Symmetry: C2
Subunit: 270 residues, 2 copies
C-alpha cells in the first residue's frame, strides 16, 4: 500500500508491547492517523502520554476485541474521528503456557477468544467496509513463529497461531481482487530452535519490528518472517511432510491416479 | 499402538462418511470395541443397521461434540460399556464455503465450534484419562489438506483445519512421554491443486481411507498424507517461506545475531 501519509490505521493491542511499537512507527514515521485499540485503559493512558509529546494524530479507544458489538462501535468511532480504515493491524494477543494435560477449558477459551476470535472479529468488521468503499486497503495479522513450530507447554498458544496463519493465507487468496493487501508477521519472542529464539528475543525491539512491518505494508509483502536462522530448521520440518507424502508413492493407488491424469493430459485442451 | 484387538476406540462423527469408514475398519478388521459418537440419531441408526449384520462390538452414543458436559458423559458411558478409551478418533467435521467477505458470525461460530472446539473437547476429555491410567493410548485428528492449502471460498474451513493441525503438532511434542501416539490425517476431498484434488475425490473410499488410518495407528505414524501428488506443489509453498526468511539474510541484524552465537559456540560447553 502506497502513500500512507494521512491514511488511517487501526491497531489492536496498541497500548503496549509489539502493537504499540507498530502504532509508534505508523504514527510518527509513516505519518498515518492511528487509532490504538486496547482493553486496558491504563495502557491507553500510558501510550497517549508518549504520543502527547510527538507530532502525531493518535486516537485511543478502549475495546475488548472479543466483543463484536463494541468492535463495530469502535470502528465507527475511528471513521468519525479520522475516516475509513485503510490499514488494519490485528496484533493483540495473549499467552499462558503449561502442560497440555493440565490446561483448563477456561485456559482454552480465553486464549482462543483473544488470539483467534479477536482477529476474526476485526477482519469481519473492517474488511467488508474496505470492499464496499472500493479504495483498497491492507490487513496485517500478527501471529508468531509458533504458527510453524510446536513447543513443549505452548499447546494452546500454538493452536491459536496456526489458526490465524490459516486465516491470513485465506485472506491472501481472496483480497487481491479488491486491491486489499495482506501481511502475516511471525515474531519469535530441536533444543536449537529455543536457542535461536532466545538470541532474537534479546535483540527484539518493538519499534524495530514496527519498521519491519512498515516496510512489508509499503511493499505488500505477505510472509514477514525476518529470521533467516529458522530456515534450515524449517526445511527439516518441511521435508518431513514431503517425505510423508512421498512415502505413499510406491503404493499402487498413486500409480492409478498417475495414469488417469496422463490420459486426461491427452484427450483434452490444456 | 499394538494389539488393537479388544481395545476401545471412540470415533466422532461415526454415523456417516469418513468417520463411519474409520469405525467399520476398526470394528471389523482390527476387532476393536468401537463407540461411534454422532449428533444425528438417524445416522447412528443407519450405522447400527450395518453393524447389526457383522461380527462386531459397536456401541452408539448420540453426542453433540460442542457440549463439554455431554462429552464427558459420553466417554463415561464408553467406559461403562466397554472400558477406558485406547484410541480417540477426532474425525467429525463440517463445512460451508463462500466468499470470505460474505461470511456471517454464525457461519464462523458453527464451523469453529465443531471443527476446532469439538476436537479440543475430545482431547481434553479423554487424554487426561489416558495419562491417569498409565497404559498409553493413541489420538487421531482428522484435519484436511486445507491445513496446508488455502483456496477460494474455503476461508473459514481452512482456518479451522490449520487450527487442529497446530493442536496435533502440539500433542505430538508432549504425548510420547506418556506413551500416547498421535496421528494427523489430512484427506483431500494453483488451478492444478484442485485438479489433483478432483482425481483423489473420485477414488476416495471411506473404508480405504479407514485402512490408511489403521495402518498409521499400528505403526504410530504422525503425518498421514497419502497423496504424493501434492509434494511438488507443497515444495513450492514451502520454498516461499524459506525464501522469505532468507530475504532478510543480507540485512545486518542477522549478521549480528550470527556473531553472537559463533561466540557462544566458543566460550561454552556444547
Ligand atoms: O505485545 P506483547 O509484548 O506480546 O504483549 P503486551 O502485554 O505487552 O501487550 C498486549 C496488549 O494487548 C491488550 N489486550 C489483551 N487482550 C485484549 C483484548 N481482548 N482486547 C483488546 N486488547 C487486549 C493488552 O491490554 C495489551 O495492551
Ligand atoms: O465424513 P464427511 O463425508 O466429511 O461428512 P458427513 O456428513 O458424511 O459426516 C459427518 C458426520 O459428523 C456428524 N456431526 C456433525 N456435527 C457434529 C457435532 N457437533 N457433534 C457430533 N457429530 C457431528 C454428522 O452428523 C455426520 O454424521
Amino acid at each position: 500500500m502506497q502513500d500512507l501519509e494521512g491514511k488511517v490505521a487501526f491497531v489492536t493491542g496498541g497500548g503496549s508491547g509489539v502493537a504499540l511499537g507498530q502504532a509508534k512507527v505508523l504514527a510518527e514515521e509513516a505519518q498515518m492517523k492511528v487509532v490504538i485499540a486496547d482493553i486496558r485503559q491504563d495502557h491507553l493512558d500510558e501510550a497517549m502520554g508518549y504520543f502527547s509529546q510527538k507530532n502525531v494524530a493518535v486516537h485511543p479507544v478502549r475495546l475488548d476485541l472479543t466483543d463484536r458489538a463494541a468492535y463495530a462501535a469502535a470502528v465507527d468511532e475511528a471513521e468519525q474521528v479520522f475516516g475509513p480504515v485503510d490499514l488494519l493491524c490485528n496484533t493483540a494477543g495473549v499467552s499462558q503456557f503449561g502442560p497440555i494435560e493440565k490446561a483448563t477449558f477456561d485456559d482454552w477459551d480465553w486464549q482462543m477468544d483473544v488470539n483467534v476470535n479477536g482477529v476474526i472479529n476485526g477482519v469481519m468488521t473492517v474488511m467488508p467496509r474496505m470492499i464496499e468503499r472500493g479504495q483498497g486497503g491492507h490487513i496485517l495479522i500478527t501471529a508468531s513463529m509458533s504458527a510453524f513450530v510446536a513447543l513443549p507447554t505452548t499447546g494452546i498458544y500454538c493452536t491459536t497461531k496456526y489458526a490465524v496463519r490459516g486465516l491470513a493465507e485465506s485472506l491472501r487468496v481472496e483480497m487481491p481482487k479488491y486491491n486489499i493487501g495482506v501481511s502475516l508477521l511471525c515474531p519469535g519472542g530441536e533444543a536449537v530452535f529455543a536457542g535461536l529464539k532466545r538470541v532474537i528475543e534479546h535483540g527484539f525491539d518493538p519499534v524495530d519490528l514496527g519498521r519491519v512491518v512498515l516496510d512489508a505494508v509499503r511493499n505488500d509483502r505477505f510472509w514477514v518472517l525476518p529470521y533467516p536462522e529458522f530456515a534450515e530448521g524449517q526445511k527439516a520440518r518441511d521435508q518431513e511432510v514431503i517425505d510423508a507424502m512421498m512415502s505413499y508413492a510406491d503404493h499402487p493407488d498413486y500409480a492409478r491416479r498417475m495414469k488417469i491424469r496422463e490420459q486426461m493430459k491427452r484427450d483434452m485442451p490444456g
